[PDB]
């Protein structure tokens, strides 16, 4: 069973695109391959949300129990981190967590790099472009969510500290004198790192998928599959809690 | 010439050695802390999370510079 | 490019804003209600314990508020009876002291039965003397006068 | 694309591993949590249950206490009359006891009076027989009657 | 020239160096902590797992970059 | 001849190797200190933050030098 | 002019550097843990097994990369 | 022939690696000693200030070399 | 050309760095385990032999690849 | 050619890395010792002066040759 | 050219660092253990000798590679 | 060519991190020892100075070979 | 060609890096051992000396090989 | 402040070369190393006779200083061993004093600048003051005399057991015998390389960074280099005593 | 000019060395001299003083030798003070003999003198009686018979 | 020149060997002579207290002769106390006998010195006893002469 690639070759890794590709042309903004997946994740989230909240049973059960458990676990983590800002940032943090989690889980579906439209289709004149590209596999999505988080945390820091946060200290004129610009650039550059890692983890996961399918698509890729299914979940949660902790250190 | 490929290779290699022992001793210190005491687990786990986040931040900094060089 | 990022920014924000009032603040309010009601249940269990203790004290307080109600009215009844007899026993003593007074008031029949000077005693002494103590033959005048003066 | 079939084959195999490794433990944590909620709810409805009836029990008992207090004082009033009638009657038959003992003493007293009177005449009869016959012997027979007793041998 | 093959080799090796000793010190600290009172076995195992997930995530970064260059 | 590419690559990698292991040992020691004592959390958090800021300073020096060389 | 030779050599050396130090600290920490007390016995042996397997995975990654380059 | 670019790149990276681990172990020992005792905070912060001053002296030597690269 | 011999030299050096420190740290763990207590000698030396075999694996891999490259 | 500037940068960077960890280690040990017991402060301060003197002597060892290459 | 010379260079230089730190950590662990437990001297001596035998065996492999290129 | 200059730069520069972190940990061990034991001051000073001497001996070896290359 | 010079430079530098780390570790372990076990000093210093003699020989071999090439 | 402003004194001079000799007009031309060694011999003999010309209890002045340093060395040696603390004591004391004064001598004013001609001309201008420690011939000599002394005292009382740690047949002990034997065989080469390169590096440092800046710069560096000169002067005797102790054991 | 810069800097280094010179040397050298001086001088001074003082301490037996003569001198003093006392104290009883001597002889001076007169009076009465018996027989009792009728 | 420098250091060591050994002997001279320094210090103390001890059996040597000789002659005088105490008492005792025998003698002659008065007194009382003053047939003297005896 080791040499199944000789009988069935997966073909060369024809996917290498590191940017969003317009899957469908539109009169306005063309429909990119990642934005449609983002909308799919959005509607799936809305569907499960209304399904768990259609009855709103007092006693949690089934899917309602699952979502209640997840939400209370996250809420407990947040109250452990910060006290007076749990509900303030809870919605945005939880949304950006679960959305990218479901995007990562969607990234492993069959045909996410194989099924697609033509500009099997390589034989056709139109170039075989893939469908089901993750939103995190779009840099623009990562940039947007990172800057949204950054503007949220700086707005709330300004609300908390007034002109104190507005100047973020940096008035020591002593040991912390040259430091004020150091944390200034540090919090300037961190959301870039967040967006970059959001892109990179998913991009690496999918290229790993492609390369391990190319080498041996039988009994080899499975531990790696476990690797990305674990890393997507843990990375999504650490992004969420990192945003929360960034807010908690911005207020303080 | 392939010189850009060598650039990307060096960039990713040094970006990988960047946080290795870093995150290793992060979780090592965290596990010593939790073994000594699990009552303050939340406060310390938050800080080890932010530290490992910073390490991964630098690693992906190197990685995306490698990508920009490659394209 | 930059417009694609700006367009994607609204999509995530709209999803967060929509789900906030849809799921988020509803379900946590259910959890918020669940926590306080459980917290209230602990208070209710606390309230049950004190009320049962309060019920015991209130039961005992009225129980304590029972005997002294009867205890007092007995005491006035007790003294009212004892002063009545004290008046009566004094009155019973009083009338008894009257009774002995007539006994001395009717001790005077002695003074009227002793009015038997001629009947008995003048004849008594002569018989127990001249006829007894002394010889039957006694010769003297004034013996009746002699005895009578001693009688008075 | 032939990769999609391979992607489907690999993805399905992951679920097959997922259908046995973590399949049971995830519901193991799920069932205990919802059981923990409902038993806490069961505790909540249970604890709320005795609060009303114990309050009702208290209301019944505080009524019973009032019922107790009312019935306890209820027999006191006749006791406030029963011992009331006894003690006055106790003085009554005592009062007749005082009057009978006085008159019987008085009837004893008049017996004492006549006993004293019969002693009083016994007192007088001695002295009257004493002063009298003293002059009778003085006048005559002082030698004669003394000489008679000389012949009593 | 074959310099691109050299680039791939250096990239993959210099990616293996980071987590290669990373997971080593990870499990060293983990076994040290679990050697004292193995009551927090679940938590320490989970933290070890997430740390090693991060480390071989960096390793896969290196591997996939080396493979893309090997293309 | 993209010599600037290898320049920027080695720049970002060698400016990432330092701060990564730097913040690693920094907040590993911070974990040790907070585990052995949580009552001084404010001061030790301040000190770990200033230390990570100090090494991240060099991190962004490397990053900005790489960016300047790139363009 | 023979760049694949040095490619294979660098692949082998740089794929062996990581595990070469990682495995030692793995088994050394395991030995320390079982030496301060032998009660845990094979439970920690399982953890050192999985750690050494995880690093030898990177080792054989380097090995297979070198073999592919050589042929 | 842009050898100035690689020169200043290696200069900044290799002057960040040293003081990086410097700052790291500086504040690591500082926070460990603070956890040991808080009453010595002034002396230990002065000594760690001396240490970080030496690290940043090395760093600014590297930076001024990087600037003279452009001169 | 001569790249074969420099390849062999770099390969053997880079395959000697890892195993050397690995051997050192495992025998150090063994010697602390021994000094902690006797009657654990058998288990700790068996684990020491396990570590020495797993590092000899990398060592002999380097040796055989060097010999293959040199021929 | 400009290779002289490359030599200067390499020399100064290699002369900064060594002391860049040396100073941190010596004063971290010093602060650990002074946190253990703050009564031998003068002696340990003299000893850490000895250490910093030696390692900064190495630093200027690198720096003077970096300047000589510029000569 | 002088590729034999750089071959000798990498042979003698690279590959000594491995045992170079290995010997230090070996004998340091041994001396710490013998200070703690001076009564297990013979076993400690045997274990340190077998460890050094293996690590300088790894070193002597590079030594004889240098001899072979010496011819 | 200026390759002799980079030879001198490498020779003086490389050859320093070993002795650098050497004297680092030498003074670290000496200061922990003197903190734990005051009256063994003569012995610990002698041993720390001879160790520092050996490290700086290697450093001046590198420097003198650099000067031999330079002239 | 100064390729002989750069070869000798790299050889002596990389060889000199070899022992210094180990010898610092040696004296650190020995100084701790004499610290908390002041009774044993004659044996431990001899084992320190035999360890440093073992580890130095690689560095002396490297420098003397550079000298042989240097002539 | 106190700026340098010494552009006039910044003449280009970075010359250095280990090779060095005096006029050597007679046979075997003498070197500037082996006139500094002779002047160090003269100075140490003068100090020895000055301390010896008044020998009395309660030493004072120079006598107190020499007694203090001698007893310090004796105690430091006794801290290692006491059986041979006096067997090699004159040797190590003489070596330490000679290298101490030799490394001092290379730091005096005009050292390295007293050209023997044969400036402002094409003459060689060989510096008369060159430290013998910073010259290989003397350094190799002291290294090899230390070596011959150590194996002399080893085989003095070790029988055939001196060559028993090596060329054994115990297996692992036989394996390590070769490397240990090579280690002690190459130790004197290490002695020479240390005790040459240390002083040579110090003096070339002084030369080059005085060439950079003439005034107010090298004073902390002067302190650093005199301290390190002290260090190698003392460690040589220390390591020789330690080596002979481990040899006799 | 090469030696000029070396000369200027070397003097500055020596001048800076003089700052710590006194502390590093003067203080340390002074301690060495005093520590040795106080040890060698004072310890040897005591033994050398006590070397010849042993004869003086053998003469401290000799100062006890006149003290041996001393307490002996008070011993003879203590002897003679009581020896003279105990004689005179006993010689006090020697005259107590003489005090007794008259006291033990005074009674014989008076008892013997008073002794004789006691018996002579008795001898007088008895010698009278034999004469009285002779005189009464010669004179006769007839005349004395009339003397018996004086009051009868 | 390397071999030439080798002899110089060895010659320097051999030249310093006389310098070192003499200072070593000078140092050993400081090291020696101090073994006895603690010897005589303790040696003197034990003998100094022994001389102080020597004064102490001297103290009893007085004291043993003190009480013994004090009571020696005193008791030697005590025995001769009572020797003359009783001898004079016996002299006093025999003083009684020589006078008691004496006082009996002159009393006998006192009776003989009053012999005439004796009868002259006896006759007076006996005659008066026989009859007031003169007595009938008194024969006071003749009757006294009848048994005058002494």
XYZ file of C-alpha atoms in Angstrom, chain A:
252
model
C 0.000 0.000 0.000
C 3.085 2.191 0.257
C 3.579 2.563 -3.516
C 0.055 3.650 -4.486
C 1.485 6.793 -6.112
C 3.015 4.680 -8.886
C -0.417 3.364 -9.856
C -2.226 6.630 -9.035
C -0.059 9.745 -9.312
C -1.593 12.854 -7.762
C 0.082 15.057 -10.365
C 2.450 17.973 -9.797
C 1.608 20.621 -7.187
C -0.092 22.901 -9.699
C -1.340 25.209 -6.918
C 1.085 27.820 -5.608
C -1.001 31.004 -5.463
C -0.175 33.248 -2.497
C -2.913 35.811 -3.155
C -6.663 35.975 -3.633
C -7.879 35.034 -7.116
C -11.185 36.317 -8.482
C -13.242 33.136 -8.812
C -16.174 34.959 -10.443
C -16.101 38.263 -12.285
C -18.653 40.816 -11.102
C -19.716 44.265 -12.377
C -18.418 45.756 -9.134
C -15.769 44.050 -7.030
C -15.013 40.618 -8.545
C -15.781 37.577 -6.413
C -12.484 36.245 -5.073
C -11.880 32.597 -4.218
C -11.504 33.390 -0.501
C -14.364 35.857 -0.026
C -16.915 33.282 -1.180
C -15.539 30.836 1.394
C -15.757 33.605 3.991
C -19.429 34.072 3.122
C -19.949 30.296 3.293
C -18.443 30.235 6.782
C -20.617 33.230 7.701
C -23.836 31.530 6.612
C -22.851 28.255 8.300
C -22.177 30.155 11.535
C -25.515 31.958 11.233
C -27.301 28.658 10.568
C -25.824 26.929 13.610
C -26.450 30.071 15.677
C -30.153 30.202 14.846
C -30.403 26.414 15.232
C -28.934 26.443 18.740
C -31.071 29.485 19.615
C -34.314 28.468 17.880
C -35.601 26.851 21.081
C -33.264 28.481 23.645
C -33.911 25.695 26.137
C -33.166 26.354 29.801
C -31.464 22.952 30.107
C -28.630 22.764 27.533
C -28.711 19.691 25.326
C -27.034 18.493 22.152
C -25.767 21.304 19.955
C -27.091 23.883 22.421
C -25.059 22.205 25.156
C -21.970 22.225 22.921
C -22.160 25.917 22.050
C -23.017 26.841 25.639
C -20.006 24.880 26.898
C -17.664 26.507 24.386
C -18.955 30.000 25.138
C -18.735 29.536 28.900
C -15.212 28.118 28.599
C -14.112 31.171 26.631
C -15.924 33.491 29.042
C -14.206 31.821 31.997
C -10.840 32.279 30.297
C -11.596 35.957 29.722
C -12.771 36.637 33.277
C -9.596 34.906 34.442
C -7.595 37.298 32.262
C -9.477 40.565 32.804
C -12.342 41.581 35.073
C -13.987 44.796 33.876
C -13.683 44.281 30.101
C -14.970 40.738 29.565
C -18.257 41.611 27.869
C -16.769 44.690 26.196
C -14.480 42.685 23.901
C -16.134 39.254 24.255
C -18.309 39.482 21.075
C -15.561 40.556 18.685
C -12.995 38.163 20.154
C -15.346 35.182 20.086
C -16.498 35.956 16.542
C -12.975 36.305 15.177
C -12.109 33.067 16.967
C -14.920 30.869 15.681
C -14.945 32.354 12.171
C -11.294 31.576 11.524
C -11.710 28.212 13.263
C -14.465 27.238 10.848
C -12.400 28.608 7.972
C -9.487 26.391 8.985
C -11.803 23.395 9.245
C -13.250 24.253 5.825
C -9.708 24.416 4.449
C -9.357 20.630 4.649
C -12.390 19.772 2.531
C -11.791 17.757 -0.647
C -11.304 19.859 -3.743
C -10.212 22.900 -1.728
C -7.195 22.980 -4.039
C -8.461 20.599 -6.715
C -12.102 21.450 -7.446
C -12.450 24.760 -9.242
C -13.363 26.607 -12.395
C -11.398 26.910 -15.642
C -9.805 30.394 -15.660
C -9.181 18.076 -15.392
C -9.470 21.658 -16.680
C -5.761 21.841 -17.534
C -6.610 19.701 -20.561
C -9.073 22.442 -21.473
C -7.640 25.654 -22.873
C -8.784 27.713 -19.901
C -6.395 27.393 -16.974
C -7.593 25.263 -14.069
C -7.978 27.681 -11.156
C -8.956 26.219 -7.765
C -12.033 26.833 -5.665
C -12.486 26.830 -1.876
C -9.497 28.937 -0.862
C -9.489 29.854 2.816
C -10.118 33.489 3.806
C -7.007 33.237 5.964
C -5.295 32.195 2.729
C -6.171 35.752 1.674
C -3.858 38.431 3.040
C -6.576 41.091 2.807
C -8.838 39.248 5.257
C -6.006 38.892 7.767
C -5.067 42.559 7.395
C -8.669 43.672 7.883
C -9.244 41.619 11.016
C -5.858 42.603 12.464
C -6.443 46.315 11.950
C -9.989 45.981 13.318
C -8.593 44.396 16.472
C -5.841 47.008 16.712
C -8.179 49.974 16.312
C -10.553 48.412 18.846
C -7.840 47.953 21.464
C -6.375 51.421 20.956
C -9.840 53.007 21.091
C -10.602 51.229 24.349
C -7.197 52.125 25.772
C -7.887 55.763 24.935
C -11.299 55.489 26.590
C -9.766 53.934 29.706
C -6.730 56.189 30.161
C -7.896 59.333 28.352
C -4.930 61.469 27.302
C -2.724 59.168 29.394
C -3.145 56.313 26.866
C -3.270 58.987 24.113
C 0.405 59.691 25.010
C 1.010 56.123 26.335
C 3.411 57.694 28.902
C 6.797 57.997 27.086
C 7.302 61.165 29.219
C 9.783 59.478 31.633
C 12.725 61.319 29.961
C 14.916 58.793 31.854
C 15.160 54.960 31.757
C 11.748 54.727 29.985
C 12.546 57.838 27.853
C 13.951 55.907 24.834
C 11.501 53.064 25.655
C 8.267 54.936 24.891
C 9.001 54.818 21.175
C 9.970 51.161 21.646
C 6.540 50.102 22.846
C 5.032 52.561 20.360
C 6.585 50.655 17.466
C 5.953 47.325 19.233
C 2.188 47.829 19.348
C 2.455 49.407 15.900
C 3.995 46.250 14.451
C 2.199 43.478 16.369
C -1.080 43.462 14.329
C 1.037 43.001 11.218
C 2.518 39.928 12.892
C -0.967 38.678 13.763
C -2.189 39.006 10.178
C 1.024 37.518 8.796
C 0.816 34.453 11.030
C -2.885 34.079 10.221
C -1.970 33.908 6.550
C 1.138 31.799 7.012
C -0.268 29.007 9.164
C -3.116 28.271 6.762
C -0.939 28.687 3.676
C 1.586 26.240 5.118
C -1.165 23.808 6.051
C -2.583 23.749 2.554
C 0.781 23.515 0.772
C 1.674 20.695 3.170
C -1.574 19.003 2.164
C -0.666 19.373 -1.504
C 2.918 18.149 -1.151
C 2.026 15.132 0.992
C -0.719 14.196 -1.454
C 1.863 14.521 -4.230
C 4.446 12.280 -2.564
C 2.283 9.511 -1.067
C -1.531 9.936 -0.998
C -2.037 6.782 1.088
C -1.555 6.456 4.873
C 1.256 9.026 4.896
C -0.709 12.324 5.147
C -2.829 11.344 8.175
C -0.476 12.369 11.054
C 0.053 15.649 9.235
C -3.735 15.990 8.917
C -3.847 15.659 12.683
C -1.155 18.326 12.866
C -3.147 20.928 10.967
C -6.490 20.104 12.587
C -4.860 20.648 15.974
C -2.840 23.708 15.005
C -5.775 25.535 13.422
C -7.876 25.224 16.571
C -5.061 26.144 18.931
C -3.857 29.019 16.753
C -7.362 30.461 16.456
C -7.819 30.371 20.215
C -4.398 31.894 20.856
C -5.173 34.692 18.387
C -8.401 35.420 20.242
C -6.831 35.346 23.696
C -3.871 37.346 22.396
C -6.243 40.087 21.293
C -7.914 39.940 24.706
C -4.564 40.102 26.509
C -3.457 42.965 24.275
C -6.540 44.869 25.384
C -5.870 43.898 29.011
C -2.318 45.240 28.803
C -3.390 48.337 26.851
C -5.807 49.376 29.596
C -3.080 48.710 32.168
